[PDB]
Design a protein around this nucleic acid. Sequence first.
DNA 1: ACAACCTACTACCTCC
DNA 2: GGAGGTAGTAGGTTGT
DNA 3: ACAACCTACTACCTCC
DNA 4: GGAGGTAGTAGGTTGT
Lengths: 733, 733
Amino acid sequence: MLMKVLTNMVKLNQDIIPNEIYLYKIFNKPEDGMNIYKIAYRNHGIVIDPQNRIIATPSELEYSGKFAIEDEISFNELPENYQNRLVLRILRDNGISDHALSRTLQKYRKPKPFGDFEVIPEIRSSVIKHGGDFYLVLHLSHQIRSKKTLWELVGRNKDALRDFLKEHRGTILLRDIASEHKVVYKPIFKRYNGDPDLIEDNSNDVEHWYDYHLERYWNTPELKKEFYKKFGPVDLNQPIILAKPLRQHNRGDLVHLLPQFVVPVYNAEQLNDILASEILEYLKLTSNQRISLLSRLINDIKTNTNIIVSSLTELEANTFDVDLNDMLQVRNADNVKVTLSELEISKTRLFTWMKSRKYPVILPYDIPQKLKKIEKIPVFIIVDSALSRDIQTFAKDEFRYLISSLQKSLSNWVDFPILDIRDKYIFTIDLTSDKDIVNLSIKLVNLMKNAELGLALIATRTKLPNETFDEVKKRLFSVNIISQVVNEATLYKRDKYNESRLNLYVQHNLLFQILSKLGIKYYVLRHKFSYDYIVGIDVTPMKLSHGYIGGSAVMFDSIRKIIPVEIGEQMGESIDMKEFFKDMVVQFGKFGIDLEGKSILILRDGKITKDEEEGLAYISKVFGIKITTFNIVKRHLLRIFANRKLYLRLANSVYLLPHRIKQSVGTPVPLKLSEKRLILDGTITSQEITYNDIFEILLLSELNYGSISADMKLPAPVHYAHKFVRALRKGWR
Amino acid sequence: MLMKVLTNMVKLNQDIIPNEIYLYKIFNKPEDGMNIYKIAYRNHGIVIDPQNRIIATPSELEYSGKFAIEDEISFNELPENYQNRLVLRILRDNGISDHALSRTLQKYRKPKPFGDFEVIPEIRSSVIKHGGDFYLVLHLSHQIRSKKTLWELVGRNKDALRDFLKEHRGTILLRDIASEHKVVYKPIFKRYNGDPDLIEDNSNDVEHWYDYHLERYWNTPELKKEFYKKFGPVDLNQPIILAKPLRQHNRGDLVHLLPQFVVPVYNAEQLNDILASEILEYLKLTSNQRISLLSRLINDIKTNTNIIVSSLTELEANTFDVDLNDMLQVRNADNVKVTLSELEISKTRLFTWMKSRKYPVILPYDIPQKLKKIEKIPVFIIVDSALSRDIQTFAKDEFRYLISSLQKSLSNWVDFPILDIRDKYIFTIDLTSDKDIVNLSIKLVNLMKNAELGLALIATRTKLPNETFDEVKKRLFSVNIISQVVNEATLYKRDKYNESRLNLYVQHNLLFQILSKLGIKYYVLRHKFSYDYIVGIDVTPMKLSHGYIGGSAVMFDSIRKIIPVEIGEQMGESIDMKEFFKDMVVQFGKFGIDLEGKSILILRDGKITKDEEEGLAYISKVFGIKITTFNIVKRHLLRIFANRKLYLRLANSVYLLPHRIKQSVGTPVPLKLSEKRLILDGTITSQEITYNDIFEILLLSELNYGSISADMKLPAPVHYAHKFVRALRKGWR
DNA sequence: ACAACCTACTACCTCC
DNA sequence: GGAGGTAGTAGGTTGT
DNA sequence: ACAACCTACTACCTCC
DNA sequence: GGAGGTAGTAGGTTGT
Ligand SMILES: [Mg+2]
Ligand SMILES: [Mg+2]
Ligand SMILES: [Mg+2]
Ligand SMILES: [Mg+2]
Ligand SMILES: [Mg+2]
Ligand SMILES: [Mg+2]
Ligand SMILES: [Zn+2]
């Protein structure tokens, strides 16, 4: 349980660190311009307090406005984050910047052309303090940009431009490269015709726009010839696209763009299958390739300067190698609580007994008492009419096979209701058409009068307008219908024993999803954690609004129960823990549980804000509950070059690897755990992450209810809070 | 049915009208600055098409950028609105502007000081085309501004400033008058302490801010002495208020303000009772005072120039004088459908029989079959603990008297359930405290286990933090509780026969509200309108978000039914009629009504947008329904100097007066009806407002369900859509 | 060159 | 939209 | 001086 | 917060 691992950190020279810094206060108003952060960057400093406009600089200020000397403190008196940012700024001042590192890296990884796009390497940097030393963290990435403008790409043809804009509807963005500041625009399509909104023959406006761009932004001899080389001569036979800015405040302003001054943003959708596979294999590097590239780059840096005094840093990691099957509980042979380990099986082989008698029978553990009194559950099959008359029959017979096999296997051993499928429940409609959806909704309302729950298996085409999908799901949810969607590409996936059945992998996943959505828990956990309630919290935007619904809290009370609650409605990303916790108390008050004197573990997907801190402190002071908070981060610049479950104690954080990558390309991304806090009687104190906390987090990372081959990274409460806020954002119930 | 009335319009000279205009196209991008409308105003023109940047100017352009000549059309070829705006701009160019008219008006109405505020007259202008002539519409108003800064107002005392900021919490705004552009700021209070957030002793920052404002905005000798005269010498013993801008985008930026460079915005709340009454009597002018002021102003204008060629214009108005009691239906003497006219009564005397036997007994008309099978309806009384031990007893005994009288009067004649009041249902809690609300909610959840509906009568204090009110209402609504709130000021209102009972007016209103909220319709209408469905639509903001919930549609199907629907969630003010009408069809599909081949009358509170037009056209084309749309406007600059129900056909609009003012101060504001449209098979045509349409609108303006003495202006569907969008915005159910 | 993060969309590769 | 991983592209929020 | 409108808060005056 | 009127104060959206 101890292994040597390599990271992407290099130790820096200790003579870069400054001796003492100066604190300065800027007297200025934020409605005149020149943001404070830009000022602090100009004078080689950082921002300590943005409210009071206090900045820290290793030298005397050179500002023009009003400032005042505040303090002359030592470097070691600063917190760790400010020290890291100051060291990063100093490194940037000494030539160790992302741009220079990327330029050096281009000597070992030349730019590569994929179709009409070009891929160029890039390096991101960070600074980390560990063991009293400062390390530079280097992250490898790529940048893909288009090389041909839209007119050159379509081949100078108006029909080609129209077809290109029509095919990539919803995933197309244009960037105007003929102006000073580049803005990303989204084209405008007719709301009912589904056609791009162009201006066919207005050559006068084409010439006027061309001359306006020429004599306003490129008004200098070398700039003039650069413009004429980059864009060429004006083509008067081109249309004019009518678009709107991607900002979410200038959408009420429509702009006319020539399809010659703009380039397309990259979306994997604008590449064929071969090029998509090649580019995805090219971008997703492995551990050894990253190690080799970083070693060559570091050698080139060290042979050029004296700042870096080491190489890829080796650290100590503790390897988790417990047996999780001992903690997973299931029932077999008519209600006998057992474990997966004792049955020489795994979580992935819990449906194999439905056709082969060699393997043992594994029954579900807890069937809810509500899904036992129902006599019949209507089953509906909805097949899209845009299929090829063979995918339709395949979809129907596969759905019938799945339902029949599930019923026959489940009814033999355990009690289970009748999932009745009838010829009056199969519908073939056009999904895009609006009248058919209304007729289907009315028919489903009429057919489910004497019923409580219903299940619908839907078969759709390869791509949908992405709003018809949500509308269909919402219309089904409004009448108590659990919908399972299978598209055409999945239906085209073939087995290898008989081509008349779906892939066994997809079949098992489909049974698992049906059972989970119905409410049946196939397996549970065994372990006791020290808390009575675990609350996972997440935030998401609001789908066409500058607000944030951003409210979801999964209380995993019981490890079993999964009940969610909605927080409310916010303006930014800051949960209101006061109202949230008042509703928190009220709900188990109505259930009959006193939420006083208990312990609550809060897992937030992101970072806890100051307002949430104050709300939690007030709630603990008033209602008398002990609160424990954790910060979980999924995206950072640190990579651990290993493929195994482990955890690394670095600085004041714990980098966990709760999963193993199954693919042969890609470096696993660790999960950062930081800022453990304890709130008691209105007092907030910091704590240290114990091994028990890491064990509890790793155990919560198991227990997925969506797939049998899942290896998810986040804990269960956070993942399910994310899914619940997904559901609330898109309006599903 | 024909009366001469006076308006606030004066005929202009016909030689002001221009001969021909020029259309110009501006080639510019809207991310560089200098808005198009400002340009068009500079060159004495108007904006025709803002998307294509087309402007109309009575002279040749003098622009500096790129423009192009588009057309040279005649004046008479323009639509009416563009002609009105062009005439308004020309009048402004010829000296007839709001500023000059207000300055002239100040000679007859001198500024008046009310406490620390000053009231100054003001005149607003508009242009209207009628009968081929152009009229100037003049509206009289007032403007109230503070004369003393905050420091001078509080008397240069920190305790006084703290108390002033604490007392006017939530309704206080400061405007910074020491800068170039004036911004309105809102102070910041502690979230739990309820105290203003100041900075007590930081005289260094006070001096620095003073010098920063002095040497940046007032940097010129006469400007320097003006600054020193307006603000005086710097007081180093003053605190610093920490506030945020009222913009709804810069709230994430905190600004420090000296309480010497800011003035308070006017809110009637910063005046005592005597001054409030005096200022409200002073602002609310009557018809004769307005006529005299306008006549003197018009005489002064005519004696100075030759543009105005007339005086206050007399027009023709048709006076409605029908008997509405013939159309109101009610039941009396054990289910006998009668009318109010035949019983020599009015809508206001339908509760007098509960204590005096001289007047006839008037029973309700339709009691829902759902409010008949209930055995008992629990009644709760909630009394605030911040009262004076006498208002509490008055509240309890008044509520008991109301419930007892209602039950005793209703049970004698018609069937009605038991509104059981018990000593276990009276609670005295502190409303502001948070623990008490949770305890009360838990107790109410426990007490209403074996129940369906409940009614709660709440007695509160004079003022509440305005969020505790909404929280209490939401918590009661979540558990099926209809709440009726009576504050302390209403409870202090005395009768004139016995001081131990509430005012008869308020009592009758309270029983009416209880009966309406329970769901009982005391009276209905008799008349048949030509439509099968009337849909009222409204929009409101979203309560701390830059989104617009803005979704409410009352389908008044039946005149009786009142069922609402929620439209959805928008970004601006533009209803999505496609999704709205799909849900529209689905709902009566589930009820069993085919919404095809019918006629629908849409009343929108505001103006129908282009997107709603296209959506309605598409829906009519697809589902085959005839749509009739109306535009209703409540705020304009036109006044009819009369007090009687009538309608005036002016230009292409109808100005209705569906109500009569009961007070002795104020001029009634007419309702503008315009832009009647008929959508059939995807074709949108304009129509002319018939007398039948005006009669139908006037009839819909009756039948209020909130008060017995109501004289509301808007039609019932629009008013109830407004109330429903109120309910959705604040989260009540 | 404001740094650390979080969204919303993509696309391929793997599992009993 | 079999669901989990990992790649990219644009947008927003929070520091105190 | 972009014009017409719509919000959200206020405050008094009237009714059988 | 008896509800409808009429007064003011700041903010936003739509023109096509
Ligand atoms: Mg799913
Ligand atoms: Mg999050
Ligand atoms: Mg999330
Ligand atoms: Mg409105
Ligand atoms: Mg409204
Ligand atoms: Mg009310
Ligand atoms: Zn916004």
